[PDB]
Design a protein around this ligand. Structure first.
Ligand SMILES: [Ca+2]
Length: 330
């Protein structure tokens, strides 16, 4: 067997004293096989469902389609395309329906699960296109989620003005997680770290870097324990949340170390003191969310038909490791 694509690339998190990382086979893939686009529900390689976890076809004017996921040329392809059909969708901020040309898109959900202690990392080439490129994880009951990467793609073709400009969005990677409460209610609760909750730095960016769409990036999380998450971009540590403490590299490269008066993983104790524990599936998808699409941050026909190969989120590999004690001379 040849070395996998990630061979020789160290795991950037530390597994603990006298521990080593062990690959979790059922959640790891370097995508060096052919899987042609398929209209039918399929677990690719027995591991990656070519759709969302139910028949819902997505937010906004998104239309997830089984045939918008393929594997070729060393990567999984998550494709945006446009057949001209419209989709009518609700503006989540006020409850009203709007109609736009739809974008057919892809969504992938793992068969397997991960649970702490675990390191999850993907090598992706974010689409050079105006849409969301997401890598995230969620428990089967939808109560506990970790967001490895939420990013909004490229700057688009010339001619965008006002709210349709994507520069603020394109430069960031959102590093976050959610714990929910009372999802049986309509008005369920959602806690995530953010400025308004007193947890800073969640929208990562670097002075000078306009977007993440011109090359491959690696983004990963070490979900170490129920009150400890660490994020890594391109093999480098960028952010830790640990109990009531958190730290991160700011956009000028400065280390910021902060201490909150509350637990920053579960501020309002929606987990009944347990923290993040529930097994999670990995989701990789692209979408056009309502807020973005209504603002004009949505691919034009000129963009999507003029540069089709840019309207694809590519995944070179996904790798998952769990810590094991060192084994000695074997
Ligand atoms: Ca590959």
């Amino acid at each position: 067997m040849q070395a996998q694509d990630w061979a020789g690339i160290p795991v950037p998190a530390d597994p603990g004293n006298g521990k080593q990382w062990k690959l979790q086979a059922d959640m790891s893939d370097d995508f060096n096989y052919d899987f042609p686009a398929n209209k039918e529900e399929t677990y690719i390689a027995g591991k990656w469902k070519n759709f969302w976890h139910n028949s819902w076809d997505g937010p906004g004017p998104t239309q997830w389609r089984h045939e918008n996921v393929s594997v070729s040329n060393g990567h999984m392809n998550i494709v945006a395309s446009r057949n001209g059909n419209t989709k009518t969708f609700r503006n989540s901020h006020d409850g009203t329906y709007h109609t736009l040309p739809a974008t057919q898109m892809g969504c992938v959900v793992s068969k397997g699960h991960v649970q702490y202690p675990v390191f999850v990392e993907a090598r992706v080439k974010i689409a050079d296109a105006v849409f969301a490129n997401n890598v995230w994880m969620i428990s089967d009951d939808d109560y506990e989620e970790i967001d490895i990467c939420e990013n909004y793609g490229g700057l688009g073709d010339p001619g965008r003005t006002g709210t349709a400009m994507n520069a603020w969005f394109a430069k960031h990677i959102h590093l976050s997680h959610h714990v929910f409460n009372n999802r049986h209610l309509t008005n369920f609760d959602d806690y995530q770290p953010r400025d308004e909750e007193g947890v800073y730095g969640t929208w990562y960016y670097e002075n000078g870097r306009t977007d993440w769409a011109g090359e491959y990036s690696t983004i990963g999380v070490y979900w170490k324990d129920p009150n400890h998450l660490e994020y890594y971009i391109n093999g480098k540590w960028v952010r830790t949340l640990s109990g009531k403490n958190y730290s991160y590299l700011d956009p000028d490269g400065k280390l910021i170390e902060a201490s909150a008066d509350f637990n920053v993983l579960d501020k309002y104790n929606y987990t009944n003191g347990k923290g993040l524990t529930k097994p999670m599936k990995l989701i990789i998808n692209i979408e056009a969310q309502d807020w973005n699409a209504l603002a004009g941050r949505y691919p034009t026909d000129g963009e999507i038909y003029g540069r089709p190969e840019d309207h694809i989120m590519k995944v070179d590999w996904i790798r998952v490791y769990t810590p094991e004690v060192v084994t000695g001379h074997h």
